[PDB]
Design a protein around this ligand. Sequence first.
Ligand SMILES: Nc1ncnc2c1ncn2[C@@H]1O[C@H](COP(=O)(O)OP(=O)(O)O)[C@@H](O)[C@H]1O
Lengths: 88, 269
Amino acid sequence: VRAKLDRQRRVFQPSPLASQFELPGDFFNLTAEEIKREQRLRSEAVERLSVLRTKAMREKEEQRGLRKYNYTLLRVRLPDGCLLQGTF
Amino acid sequence: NGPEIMSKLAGESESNLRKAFEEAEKNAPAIIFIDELDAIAPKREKTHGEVERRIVSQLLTLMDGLKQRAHVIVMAATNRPNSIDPALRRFGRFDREVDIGIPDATGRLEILQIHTKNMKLADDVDLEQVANETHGHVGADLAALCSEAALQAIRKKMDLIDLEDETIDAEVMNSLAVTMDDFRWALSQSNPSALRETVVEVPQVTWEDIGGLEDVKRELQELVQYPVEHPDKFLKFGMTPSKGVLFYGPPGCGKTLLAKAIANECQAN
Ligand SMILES: Nc1ncnc2c1ncn2[C@@H]1O[C@H](COP(=O)(O)OP(=O)(O)O)[C@@H](O)[C@H]1O
């Protein structure tokens, strides 16, 4: 005996008001931490390309992205402007 | 400087060189510093054109003219003492020279301390550790390391306090300390400009650093120190001091420490 997945069938109507937003004047001015982090990532990316390592070390890093999800939410965009959503 | 004088047209390079010497006399006492001497006056036997040999002759006669130009000393800088026309190094002219070389671990620490005179350092900053890590670095590189560490401290703290303007409050400046992480970051950004050249230094190895070889340590003191500590006994007995010793045997037994340890006690390079 196992509980059945609830589809939670819903239809939505997007409000045009969600797309109306203006940025602050200083939005595009990056901070010392954001500029130092970006330059460190550039130096680390060049270093990673330079490192002499075996396949086992390569897999240990790549494998970090493999376990996050086992369910999905699907949406369908309909010709009449309505959005149909459910759980699978 | 060589390349600027050489960038001039024939006749202009000689005129400009002569003017500098005449101005030094007018403003005597004066020092004339010629940078990249090997570029302004390269070996004549290594060039082909008349203009390149001409400028060497022009400098050679101007150097001799210093017997008339009272209180004028000409200094020059090159990368290699044997890359300049040998005539320049003949009696008179450039009859003295000094080997600057590369600073050692002690000199590098001194340079870092000099370029931090105004900087407020945090308790975790260890400039001796930096000086030991910065192998192959020269003063130009160590100065960059200090300025880079200062800038990182400014961007982390002060840019969240001060305006994007030219004038800063004295209190905010003095409230900033530069941490060891800012120096280590600069070390990752800098790259030594003189890593391949041989570095001559007074070693820090002492006799207590060598295990065993008790008689060899004493023997080196007899060979190296006694000829100058007790010269009257060597003359009295007509004994000619040895000029050197050869070590042989397995590797990794202390041959290097033996030579450094005697150099250390003698305060020798
Ligand atoms: N007699 C010794 N006592 C203490 N340490 C030694 C001794 N011999 C060698 N070592 C260690 O071995 C290292 C290498 O010594 P070195 O004389 O440079 O070997 P090499 O013969 O390869 O030049 C030194 O850093 C030193 O710490």
